[PDB]
């Protein structure tokens, strides 16, 4: 759409018994692809590990 791309996401996550959409019915997110996001993982608190 000029400099900004347009992306539609209809992903779904499954609850205990119901399937619900990740995003609500009508939202948009002004974002950047170069925005840095963290994927930090903690320490495994298992004796065997």
């Amino acid at each position: 759409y000029g400099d900004v791309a347009i992306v539609v996401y209809s992903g779904q996550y499954v609850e205990n018994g119901v399937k619900k959409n990740f995003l609500p019915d009508n939202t948009m997110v002004l974002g950047n692809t170069q925005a840095r996001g963290l994927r930090t993982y903690g320490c495994i608190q298992d004796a065997d590990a």
Partner: protein, 47 residues
């Protein structure tokens, strides 16, 4: 009785019939050998 008639060509009056479904979706067949036929479908739903 004294007719002396010739006969020209004849029409056919065909249908307007073309499956489009046994040729686009049902491409595979499976003959039976028994009476009952099962069809399972695994349900996908996770906590």
């Amino acid at each position: 009785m004294y007719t002396t008639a010739q006969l020209l060509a004849a029409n056919e009056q065909k249908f307007k019939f073309d499956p489009l479904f046994l040729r686009l979706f049902f491409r595979e067949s499976y003959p039976f050998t028994t009476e009952k036929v099962y069809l399972s479908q695994i349900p996908g739903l996770v906590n």
